[PDB]
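Operator note (shift B, R.M.): manual run for Cellulase requested after the automated queue skipped it. Running by hand, logging everything below so the morning shift can see what happened. Input copied straight from the record, untouched. If output looks odd, do not overwrite the archive copy; leave it for review.
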Amino acid sequence: QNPSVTISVNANAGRHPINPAVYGLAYATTATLADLNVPLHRYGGNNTSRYNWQLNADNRGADWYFESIGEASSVAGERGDTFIANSQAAGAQAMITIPTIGWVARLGANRSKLASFSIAKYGAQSGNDWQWFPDAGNGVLTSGQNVTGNNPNDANTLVDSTFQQGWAQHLVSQWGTAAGGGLRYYILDNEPSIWFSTHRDVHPVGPTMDEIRDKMLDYGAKIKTVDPSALIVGPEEWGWSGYTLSGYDQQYGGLHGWSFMPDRNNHGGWDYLPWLLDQLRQNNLSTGRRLLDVFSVHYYPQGGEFGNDTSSAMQLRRNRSTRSLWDPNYIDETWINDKVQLIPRLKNWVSTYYPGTLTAITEYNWGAESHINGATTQADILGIFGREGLDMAARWTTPDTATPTYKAIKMYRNYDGNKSAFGDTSVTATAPNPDNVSAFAAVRSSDGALTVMVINKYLSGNTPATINLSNFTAQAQAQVWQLTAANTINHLSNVSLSGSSLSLTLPAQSVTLLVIPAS
Ligand SMILES: [Zn+2]
Ligand SMILES: [Zn+2]
Ligand SMILES: [Zn+2]
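Run finished. Output pasted below as returned.
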């Protein structure tokens, strides 16, 4: 039905390891972490920036009327300990976000809720938590203008690095050091550059690159001192603009155009993250101690695919927009309007401004989770991650178990229900056009088997495909597992060799895994 495709896989080219940390997830259950066989679990997000560990509570920020709400438990840090217990109960490494913003939540009498923009204290506003906290306004006047001189102490308390160090001490005491099997990843806040938006109530002015640098040096030292075996992750920036412009400049730009970036101008025209990395590198050179271990950013496509729009046009965009993660000649079809090639960009930035620093995308989501288009896209993302050498990744939230996207992940980490996974040694696999059909390959170390994932992104018609192998002696038959809109991981009939190649027909919008044993 569709034009035939030839995919060549050379087990001897592009050889490099695939860190299983690329299959990371945020907010999943022990059951899911175990079923999907994911080794990384992330506790992060907007509210985690306002978490007070001694009170065991946080502020929802712009997400929910800037309300300070406590957890049921009054035990300092139980949220974190419960998160960690659930993670290792599934054999997964946990990541805990440690506030750096300073203003964390505090509570009222008997752990009662507090609000940063009390309507009674600041006047009528365009929004409020009418159903659960009517006095909690959205911080916007009826005129549409933001409320301004609000007192940050209304629902918060100013804390510092020594305060957070205490949490690290609590963590190490309860779980041990990282070297001993305790918390391995400490994340420094969340999307700091846009604190002036998400955490407007407590940080109305965007942070300069100086203040983000100082906070990482400061908070990073405190944590390393408590646990030198632990790994620090940051800066968790939000997206494109936050890669070259500090929060101060992003905000300034929004208010006066982009003809003059003050913070950038005071730093020799340097780009934000490159400068931050270089700045950390210099400090590492002066003290001889590494404070940052993993360079992390978040990335969500901007063309509108993040959501549930499953029209043909959007599905096609999802088939393409995925290039922004690796393709150097792909201009993002959005306001970004530039060649982002994320992973190569992150790798080059680390290699150029702070060698030895790992790379990660701690937040991403291409949408359409309950739709096959979302699954082919997710499977595409996972393949790209392993091929491009991303060190770690954390999908923003875990897809529902009934979803086809959930299976897409499973196709890589537990396709047979036996925890069998995609290979750990990436090898070259080239497809003539990833937009309609992409492929990824690797060689498993335990089995020695060659695993080849083929994604047919075409919206209709069967697609005949032939896989040509190079430098791999395989048995006469390759196993086949497949996923389609039928939302079921099917174990198809084996396919036979025809020398050093195998052919098969690929259904439209499908994820097929080929397990080719060695010898
Ligand atoms: Zn600040
Ligand atoms: Zn304690
Ligand atoms: Zn400076």
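Quick read of the result: The two ends are 35 Å apart (CA to CA). The chain is about 25% helix and 25% strand.
Leaving this for review. - R.M.
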